[PDB]
Design a binder for this molecule. Structure first.
Ligand SMILES: O=C(O)C(Cc1ccccc1-c1ccccc1)C(=O)O
Length: 222
Protein backbone atom coordinates (compact mmCIF):
# COMPACT_ATOMS: atom_id res chain seq x y z
CA UNK A 1 0.00 0.00 0.00
CA UNK A 2 2.21 2.82 -1.31
CA UNK A 3 1.63 6.34 -0.05
CA UNK A 4 -0.42 7.49 -3.08
CA UNK A 5 -2.48 4.27 -2.86
CA UNK A 6 -5.01 2.78 -0.49
CA UNK A 7 -7.05 4.03 2.40
CA UNK A 8 -5.98 7.35 3.83
CA UNK A 9 -7.52 7.97 7.28
CA UNK A 10 -10.30 10.50 7.80
CA UNK A 11 -8.20 12.59 10.20
CA UNK A 12 -4.57 12.89 11.27
CA UNK A 13 -2.97 15.07 13.95
CA UNK A 14 0.75 14.65 14.45
CA UNK A 15 0.74 16.90 17.52
CA UNK A 16 -0.93 14.00 19.38
CA UNK A 17 1.85 11.66 18.27
CA UNK A 18 4.89 13.54 19.53
CA UNK A 19 5.99 14.65 16.04
CA UNK A 20 5.68 18.43 16.54
CA UNK A 21 7.90 20.78 18.56
CA UNK A 22 6.53 23.88 20.33
CA UNK A 23 5.34 26.82 18.25
CA UNK A 24 8.16 29.29 17.54
CA UNK A 25 8.23 33.02 16.74
CA UNK A 26 10.14 34.15 13.65
CA UNK A 27 10.02 37.77 14.83
CA UNK A 28 10.68 40.61 12.41
CA UNK A 29 12.69 38.38 10.06
CA UNK A 30 11.11 36.93 6.90
CA UNK A 31 12.31 33.40 7.59
CA UNK A 32 9.09 31.39 7.73
CA UNK A 33 10.64 29.23 5.00
CA UNK A 34 13.30 28.14 7.52
CA UNK A 35 10.75 27.48 10.27
CA UNK A 36 8.58 25.46 7.87
CA UNK A 37 11.66 23.50 6.76
CA UNK A 38 12.86 22.67 10.28
CA UNK A 39 9.32 21.66 11.20
CA UNK A 40 9.22 19.05 8.45
CA UNK A 41 12.71 17.84 9.35
CA UNK A 42 11.77 17.63 13.04
CA UNK A 43 8.87 15.35 12.12
CA UNK A 44 11.03 13.00 10.08
CA UNK A 45 13.73 12.99 12.77
CA UNK A 46 11.15 11.93 15.36
CA UNK A 47 9.84 9.22 13.03
CA UNK A 48 13.34 7.90 12.29
CA UNK A 49 15.00 8.07 15.72
CA UNK A 50 12.17 8.42 18.23
CA UNK A 51 13.57 11.69 19.59
CA UNK A 52 11.95 15.11 19.17
CA UNK A 53 14.46 17.97 19.06
CA UNK A 54 14.28 21.63 17.98
CA UNK A 55 16.35 22.04 14.82
CA UNK A 56 18.01 25.32 13.85
CA UNK A 57 16.20 27.73 11.47
CA UNK A 58 19.14 30.13 11.87
CA UNK A 59 21.44 27.46 10.41
CA UNK A 60 19.22 27.63 7.31
CA UNK A 61 18.88 31.43 7.27
CA UNK A 62 22.66 31.87 7.38
CA UNK A 63 23.85 28.99 5.23
CA UNK A 64 21.36 28.33 2.38
CA UNK A 65 23.16 30.78 0.14
CA UNK A 66 20.62 31.09 -2.69
CA UNK A 67 17.67 31.62 -0.37
CA UNK A 68 17.31 35.24 0.72
CA UNK A 69 17.69 34.79 4.49
CA UNK A 70 15.17 37.16 6.08
CA UNK A 71 14.04 38.04 2.56
CA UNK A 72 12.41 34.70 1.76
CA UNK A 73 13.34 31.28 0.51
CA UNK A 74 12.18 27.87 -0.69
CA UNK A 75 11.90 24.86 1.61
CA UNK A 76 13.05 22.60 -1.23
CA UNK A 77 16.32 24.55 -1.29
CA UNK A 78 16.60 24.17 2.49
CA UNK A 79 16.23 20.37 2.33
CA UNK A 80 18.82 20.21 -0.45
CA UNK A 81 21.25 22.22 1.66
CA UNK A 82 20.91 19.81 4.58
CA UNK A 83 21.47 16.88 2.22
CA UNK A 84 24.59 18.35 0.61
CA UNK A 85 25.89 19.72 3.94
CA UNK A 86 25.49 16.24 5.50
CA UNK A 87 23.59 17.75 8.42
CA UNK A 88 21.71 20.52 10.20
CA UNK A 89 22.44 21.80 13.71
CA UNK A 90 20.07 21.75 16.63
CA UNK A 91 18.47 24.98 17.80
CA UNK A 92 20.51 24.79 21.01
CA UNK A 93 23.77 24.52 19.05
CA UNK A 94 22.86 27.24 16.54
CA UNK A 95 20.30 29.55 18.13
CA UNK A 96 17.83 31.85 16.40
CA UNK A 97 18.82 35.51 16.15
CA UNK A 98 16.20 36.91 13.75
CA UNK A 99 18.66 38.40 11.27
CA UNK A 100 20.93 36.89 8.66
CA UNK A 101 24.53 36.35 9.79
CA UNK A 102 27.60 34.57 8.46
CA UNK A 103 27.23 30.80 8.25
CA UNK A 104 28.43 29.25 11.53
CA UNK A 105 27.46 25.60 10.94
CA UNK A 106 29.31 23.15 13.19
CA UNK A 107 29.16 19.35 12.68
CA UNK A 108 29.52 18.89 16.45
CA UNK A 109 26.00 20.27 16.81
CA UNK A 110 24.55 18.16 13.98
CA UNK A 111 21.13 16.83 14.92
CA UNK A 112 19.58 15.58 11.65
CA UNK A 113 20.47 14.59 8.11
CA UNK A 114 18.52 14.62 4.85
CA UNK A 115 18.44 12.30 1.81
CA UNK A 116 16.55 14.60 -0.54
CA UNK A 117 12.93 15.66 -0.87
CA UNK A 118 9.73 15.23 -2.82
CA UNK A 119 7.30 17.83 -3.98
CA UNK A 120 3.51 17.37 -3.90
CA UNK A 121 1.96 17.66 -7.38
CA UNK A 122 1.05 21.32 -7.72
CA UNK A 123 -2.45 22.17 -6.56
CA UNK A 124 -3.40 18.58 -5.72
CA UNK A 125 -4.99 18.48 -2.28
CA UNK A 126 -5.66 14.72 -2.40
CA UNK A 127 -1.93 14.12 -2.91
CA UNK A 128 -1.18 16.51 -0.04
CA UNK A 129 -3.61 14.56 2.17
CA UNK A 130 -2.02 11.22 1.34
CA UNK A 131 1.43 12.73 1.92
CA UNK A 132 0.52 14.10 5.36
CA UNK A 133 -1.03 10.76 6.31
CA UNK A 134 1.82 8.55 5.14
CA UNK A 135 4.93 10.71 5.65
CA UNK A 136 4.27 13.19 8.46
CA UNK A 137 4.15 16.99 8.67
CA UNK A 138 4.58 18.61 5.26
CA UNK A 139 5.99 22.07 4.45
CA UNK A 140 3.53 24.30 2.60
CA UNK A 141 3.31 27.90 1.37
CA UNK A 142 0.18 30.06 1.48
CA UNK A 143 -1.20 33.54 1.03
CA UNK A 144 -1.14 34.85 4.62
CA UNK A 145 -1.61 38.51 3.68
CA UNK A 146 -5.32 38.89 4.42
CA UNK A 147 -6.51 40.63 7.58
CA UNK A 148 -8.94 37.73 8.07
CA UNK A 149 -6.02 35.30 8.22
CA UNK A 150 -3.82 37.43 10.46
CA UNK A 151 -6.60 37.94 13.04
CA UNK A 152 -7.86 34.36 13.00
CA UNK A 153 -8.85 32.95 16.36
CA UNK A 154 -11.00 29.87 15.82
CA UNK A 155 -12.99 27.84 13.34
CA UNK A 156 -12.07 26.60 9.87
CA UNK A 157 -10.54 29.51 7.95
CA UNK A 158 -11.86 30.31 4.49
CA UNK A 159 -11.72 33.63 2.64
CA UNK A 160 -12.72 33.90 -1.01
CA UNK A 161 -10.20 36.77 -1.35
CA UNK A 162 -7.23 34.51 -0.58
CA UNK A 163 -4.89 34.46 -3.59
CA UNK A 164 -3.52 31.00 -4.38
CA UNK A 165 -0.93 32.68 -6.65
CA UNK A 166 0.42 34.95 -3.88
CA UNK A 167 2.44 32.45 -1.83
CA UNK A 168 3.96 34.88 0.66
CA UNK A 169 4.32 32.76 3.79
CA UNK A 170 5.57 29.27 4.65
CA UNK A 171 3.96 27.08 7.34
CA UNK A 172 3.67 23.40 8.34
CA UNK A 173 0.75 21.06 7.70
CA UNK A 174 0.74 18.78 10.76
CA UNK A 175 -2.57 17.04 10.09
CA UNK A 176 -6.06 17.34 8.63
CA UNK A 177 -9.62 16.56 9.58
CA UNK A 178 -13.13 17.98 9.76
CA UNK A 179 -14.76 20.36 12.22
CA UNK A 180 -18.54 20.83 12.29
CA UNK A 181 -18.74 19.53 8.75
CA UNK A 182 -15.92 21.70 7.36
CA UNK A 183 -12.83 19.86 6.12
CA UNK A 184 -9.55 21.44 7.16
CA UNK A 185 -5.77 21.31 7.25
CA UNK A 186 -4.07 21.66 10.65
CA UNK A 187 -1.45 24.39 10.18
CA UNK A 188 1.45 25.24 12.51
CA UNK A 189 2.52 28.87 12.09
CA UNK A 190 5.68 30.65 13.30
CA UNK A 191 4.12 33.78 14.82
CA UNK A 192 4.28 32.60 18.43
CA UNK A 193 1.88 30.72 20.69
CA UNK A 194 -0.11 33.94 21.18
CA UNK A 195 -1.24 33.90 17.54
CA UNK A 196 -4.33 32.10 16.25
CA UNK A 197 -5.32 29.09 18.35
CA UNK A 198 -2.20 28.50 20.49
CA UNK A 199 -0.11 29.13 17.37
CA UNK A 200 -2.22 27.07 14.96
CA UNK A 201 -4.87 27.71 12.31
CA UNK A 202 -7.35 25.30 10.74
CA UNK A 203 -7.45 26.10 7.02
CA UNK A 204 -10.22 25.03 4.63
CA UNK A 205 -9.47 21.76 2.82
CA UNK A 206 -10.90 20.65 -0.56
CA UNK A 207 -12.20 24.18 -1.13
CA UNK A 208 -10.44 24.85 -4.46
CA UNK A 209 -6.90 24.83 -3.02
CA UNK A 210 -7.75 27.75 -0.74
CA UNK A 211 -4.88 30.19 -0.13
CA UNK A 212 -2.65 28.05 -2.38
CA UNK A 213 -2.14 25.40 0.30
CA UNK A 214 -1.11 22.67 -2.18
CA UNK A 215 0.81 24.85 -4.67
CA UNK A 216 4.26 24.68 -3.02
CA UNK A 217 4.21 21.65 -0.71
CA UNK A 218 7.19 19.38 -0.05
CA UNK A 219 8.70 17.02 2.51
CA UNK A 220 12.28 15.92 3.20
CA UNK A 221 13.38 12.34 2.88
CA UNK A 222 15.41 11.07 5.82
O1 LIG B 1 -10.13 12.59 -1.80
C1 LIG B 1 -9.85 13.13 -0.70
O2 LIG B 1 -9.11 14.15 -0.66
C2 LIG B 1 -10.39 12.57 0.60
C3 LIG B 1 -10.93 11.15 0.49
C4 LIG B 1 -9.88 10.05 0.48
C5 LIG B 1 -8.58 10.35 0.11
C6 LIG B 1 -7.58 9.39 0.08
C7 LIG B 1 -7.89 8.08 0.42
C8 LIG B 1 -9.18 7.76 0.79
C9 LIG B 1 -10.18 8.72 0.82
C10 LIG B 1 -11.57 8.25 1.23
C11 LIG B 1 -12.61 8.19 0.31
C12 LIG B 1 -13.86 7.74 0.70
C13 LIG B 1 -14.08 7.34 2.01
C14 LIG B 1 -13.04 7.38 2.93
C15 LIG B 1 -11.79 7.83 2.53
C16 LIG B 1 -11.39 13.54 1.20
O3 LIG B 1 -12.35 13.95 0.49
O4 LIG B 1 -11.28 13.94 2.39
Amino acid sequence: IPEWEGRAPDSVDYRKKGYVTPVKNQGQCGSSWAFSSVGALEGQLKKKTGKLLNLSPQNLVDCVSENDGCGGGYMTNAFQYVQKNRGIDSEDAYPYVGQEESCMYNPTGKAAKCRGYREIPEGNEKALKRAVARVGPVSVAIDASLTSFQFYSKGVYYDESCNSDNLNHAVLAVGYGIQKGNKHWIIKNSWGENWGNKGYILMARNKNNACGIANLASFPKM
